[PDB]
Amino acid sequence: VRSSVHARWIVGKVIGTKMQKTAKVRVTRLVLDPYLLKYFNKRKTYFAHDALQQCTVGDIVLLRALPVPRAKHVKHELAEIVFKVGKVIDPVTGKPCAGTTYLESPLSSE
Amino acid sequence: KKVRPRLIAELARRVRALREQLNRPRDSQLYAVDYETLTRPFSGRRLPVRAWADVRRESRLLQLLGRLPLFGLGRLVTRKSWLWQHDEPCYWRLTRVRPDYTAQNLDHGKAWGILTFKGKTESEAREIEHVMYHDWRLVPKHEEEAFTAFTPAPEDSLASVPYPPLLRAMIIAERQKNGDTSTEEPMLNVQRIRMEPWDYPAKQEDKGRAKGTPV
């Protein structure tokens, strides 16, 4: 009703950013194998519009379907960078982390 | 999933539409009638057996109006089929005429007018149908006043009819199921439905035309 794009919200990973104001995103979904009854990732490429070209290869992003595709393949837009590559803020504490270790102790600000 | 374009289906479509607009048959060709065989030479189709009498006697609208100063503007034209069926005055007030110039006697064309069916005038003038029919008759000027004279009779009529038996039984069971207790009858409001006669002039401006396929 609000948009003609099937996928309204999808989370992916920026594989490449070689187009102006556009980010190539790889989205993975779990598809069941009817015979083995096991879930496997079936990936798909999405073209997102990044006005400020703030995306970096390797970061997780959130896409929001546009009302109507602005281009032949661009159907979404960059809603927000979930995990910035190398600079992710733990949502539970809001503190920087470099893997499974805190770069800034959570106790600094109690 | 990239459909291979079909250009010849679009080129032909434009050409066929264009030819239908430049070779279109006129009213003189479409609506001509052989009065001995009672067929339409254009298509070779016999008329119905109930029309044959009237195709040899009455006149078409524009073989009456082609004898008048401005194709009979502001004049009343009735129809033989109305005078027999309905006593009340039924007529069209002519307001605009588009004659067919390709007829040698200018006996075809179109006409717009104000209908007055059974004494009830219409607010605005639309296009007249059944121009080609052999059923028309022109109201003389001096009779225009005694032909138009009409007094409306009382229109009192049934306003509500019963529901059919089963529906009525199901309308009285909802009431009692919901708890409502009443002794009134369910009745249908038939005052909205204005039943018009089957011979009421329809709209000729939403009606089609014969294709240009002469036979």
Partner: protein
């Protein structure tokens, strides 16, 4: 094989069943060309009546006439069917007795 290996490959693809001399058809119509005999492979010893016929498909194969005795001649019409002749290698077609020119084996 692992589940990941089984997912990439997929359902086993059954080799397309090959067709025989009848091209997957019950019978076939053919014209007799020759009428010779062939010897079985060891350890069987006999002379088996066979015939080279050109089928309606266009090919020209060797057929085996069953029964005791026959009167098949060049240009005749016979209905062939499948069924390998075990003694004769390379003979995969059998003439239908009682059809077209070929007639039922006379009793005794």
């Amino acid at each position: 094989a692992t589940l990941n290996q089984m997912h990439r490959l997929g359902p086993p693809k059954r080799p397309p069943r090959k067709l025989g001399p009848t091209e997957g058809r019950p019978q076939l119509k053919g014209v007799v060309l020759c009428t010779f005999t062939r010897k079985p492979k060891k350890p069987n010893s006999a002379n088996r009546k066979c015939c080279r016929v050109r089928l309606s498909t266009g090919r020209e194969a060797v057929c085996f006439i069953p029964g005791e005795g026959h009167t098949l001649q060049e240009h005749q019409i016979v209905l062939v069917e499948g069924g390998r002749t075990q003694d004769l290698p390379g003979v995969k077609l059998t003439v239908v007795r009682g059809k077209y020119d070929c007639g039922h084996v006379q009793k005794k």
